[PDB]
Write an enzyme that holds these catalytic residues in place. Structure first.
Site, mmCIF file in Angstrom:
data_model
loop_
_atom_site.group_PDB
_atom_site.id
_atom_site.type_symbol
_atom_site.label_atom_id
_atom_site.label_comp_id
_atom_site.label_asym_id
_atom_site.label_seq_id
_atom_site.Cartn_x
_atom_site.Cartn_y
_atom_site.Cartn_z
ATOM 1 N N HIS B 41 -11.549 -36.671 3.833
ATOM 2 C CA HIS B 41 -11.969 -37.533 2.736
ATOM 3 C C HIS B 41 -11.113 -37.351 1.486
ATOM 4 O O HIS B 41 -11.351 -38.042 0.489
ATOM 5 C CB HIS B 41 -13.471 -37.345 2.432
ATOM 6 C CG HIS B 41 -13.866 -36.010 1.866
ATOM 7 N ND1 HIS B 41 -13.337 -35.493 0.702
ATOM 8 C CD2 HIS B 41 -14.808 -35.126 2.273
ATOM 9 C CE1 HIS B 41 -13.908 -34.330 0.439
ATOM 10 N NE2 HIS B 41 -14.805 -34.086 1.378
ATOM 11 N N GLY B 143 -15.020 -29.715 -6.574
ATOM 12 C CA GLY B 143 -13.697 -29.180 -6.338
ATOM 13 C C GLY B 143 -13.633 -28.083 -5.303
ATOM 14 O O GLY B 143 -12.545 -27.534 -5.078
ATOM 15 N N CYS B 145 -14.466 -28.494 -2.043
ATOM 16 C CA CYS B 145 -14.158 -29.016 -0.715
ATOM 17 C C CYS B 145 -12.879 -28.380 -0.194
ATOM 18 O O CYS B 145 -11.923 -28.159 -0.945
ATOM 19 C CB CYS B 145 -14.018 -30.533 -0.756
ATOM 20 S SG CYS B 145 -15.513 -31.377 -1.260
#
Ligand SMILES: Cc1cncc(C(=O)N2C[C@H]3CC[C@@H](C2)N3[C@@H](c2cccc(F)c2)c2cn(CCc3ccsc3)nn2)c1
Ligand SMILES: [Cl-]
Ligand SMILES: [Mg+2]
Lengths: 300, 302
Positions: B41, B143, B145
């Site tokens: 993503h 942030g 991920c």
């Protein structure tokens, strides 16, 4: 979201751990520049440590950094820490300082065995100068630390376990935390107290994370609360503590003495089957800075 | 003595964390040999995220659109591929700090260490368990991920989790390093919710054995139970079924402590019925279920 007991990344310290063997004993040492620091009770054979060390020769100290062996070229003692001069400067030495922490402050512990790191966890220097760690035989010399930017601040070296299962050690200059000695004698942890400013910080962490049921309309005075605190074996709350919590008070709209009223009620009424951040007890091993760091996202 | 939620030393993973930037999005990647793994993503916009067509989005990307930064070193992407929900960026440099590693998909109740990372820089390390409902109770901010979960038994890093998102109840969901989500979740902004969680029974029992090993016996009783009678009671407290596999797995701790597995089950039954009565077990006032039998042997014995 989420709040967890979080240790600093341990890589900068892993590269400093070595194994130290004298006579029958094996424990851990910390290799920084060309010196290995370890507990002086490694000293082979009511001890007079200055007298026992003169009998020792450099080559009685076997030091291993992994498979590689480091040659000891000298030895000296500083309080309860032994300092082994080696031929090679540790190429993985980080930027570092030796600091002494205060009761109530936290640090990361890198638990080690035979010079090999095995685990990392967070712990607080208790008011009685012990820590509630997890150590087995061979963990002596494991170290505690904090990291600010790229600088490792070493604050703890593990020496011994006390009859209650809690742990005692020194700063890296060899000064014990608390009224302990590195001897086989009768020693016991003193009665402990709860770190009040850290409980308050944790309640702010809970509020930030949506846990708000313990809040109430009331506030109190520093003098009134501290009388409840001493009654419940809580450390006194000082004006400096109130100031340190300032940030969290601003961010949540809960003044410290407003939160003290909540803590008062919790101490007087319990939690009535409820939990805060997944605990049925009041947690006191998060500092205000630990809560700001983790509810904001600092990195190293 | 002592018993703590203990993470693995993180240095071997720290040397693998990088920053991956696509457009306005920046997150973390895992750099092993000449490949950087990150959540796919990273190529989405927030608009794309309701019903993103990842194949269509990725085919439109050029290698130079992916800005990968390892410390103060910009790595150059030379190719890319997608595997389930993970993006694999081929880079021209191999990571000289790559450890011995494997990718492992774990089962509910297993534990691992999480290295929380932001902008490619590690922030902290803590222990997590895969919940029965395929979420984890982490600490992840915006942030985070791309942060990974791992174990390091012997000197090999087994990567088992990559963080993708936070669900509405404040718990976290992600994939294995082959890009397959744990649980029914998808990398879309469509409505999704964690199922009702349950307590990891075998881990509670392991922790009770840990408590005995550490010298605490106040919760034992003189009773036993059949396995089926235990499960009939346990499920009424939203506990996971205990299987014969779980009973076999506890054999070692049973042997060490001298307490039969079904006798310890009888102790747990009573704790569920009575509570702790103002007592604690290993410093907790609740029954802890994020220590596995393997964890207990690791920390209490070696
Ligand atoms: C609290 C928390 C815990 N863990 C992780 C996070 C955290 O940073 N993200 C996770 C969440 C929530 C915000 C964002 C990224 N989401 C991304 C997302 C949303 C839904 C499902 C999913 F699989 C992933 C996402 C990515 N894009 C593209 C545009 C964009 C890029 C950065 S912001 C907007 N749009 N949505 C936050
Ligand atoms: Cl597993
Ligand atoms: Mg109030």
């Amino acid at each position: 979201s989420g709040f967890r007991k979080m240790a600093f990344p341990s890589g900068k310290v892993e590269g400093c751990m070595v194994q130290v063997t004298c006579g029958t004993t094996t424990l851990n040492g910390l290799w920084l520049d060309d010196v290995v620091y370890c507990p002086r009770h490694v000293i082979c054979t009511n001890p007079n440590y200055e007298d026992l060390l003169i009998r020792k020769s450099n080559h009685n100290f076997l030091v291993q950094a992994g498979n590689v062996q480091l040659r000891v070229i000298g030895h000296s003692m500083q309080n309860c820490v032994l300092k082994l001069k080696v031929d090679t400067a540790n190429p993985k030495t980080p930027k570092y300082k030796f600091v002494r922490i205060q009761p109530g402050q936290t640090f990361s512990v890198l638990a080690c065995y035979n010079g090999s790191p095995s685990g990392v966890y967070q712990c607080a220097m208790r008011p009685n100068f012990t820590i509630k760690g997890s150590f087995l035989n061979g963990s002596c010399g494991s170290v505690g630390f904090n990291i600010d930017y790229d600088c490792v601040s070493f604050c703890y070296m593990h020496h011994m376990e006390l009859p209650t299962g809690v742990h005692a050690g020194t700063d890296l200059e060899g000064n014990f935390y608390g009224p302990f000695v590195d001897r086989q004698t009768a020693q016991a942890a003193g009665t402990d107290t709860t770190i009040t400013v850290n409980v308050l910080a944790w309640l702010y962490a809970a509020v930030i994370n949506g846990d708000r049921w313990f809040l109430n309309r009331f506030t109190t005075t520093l003098n009134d609360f501290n009388l409840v605190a001493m009654k419940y074996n809580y450390e006194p709350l000082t004006q400096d503590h109130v100031d340190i919590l300032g940030p969290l008070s601003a961010q949540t709209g809960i003044a410290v003495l407003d939160m003290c009223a909540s803590l008062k009620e919790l101490l007087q009424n319990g939690m009535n089957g409820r939990t805060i951040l997944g605990s049925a007890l009041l947690e006191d091993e998060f500092t205000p800075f630990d809560v700001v760091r983790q509810c904001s996202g600092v990195t190293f």
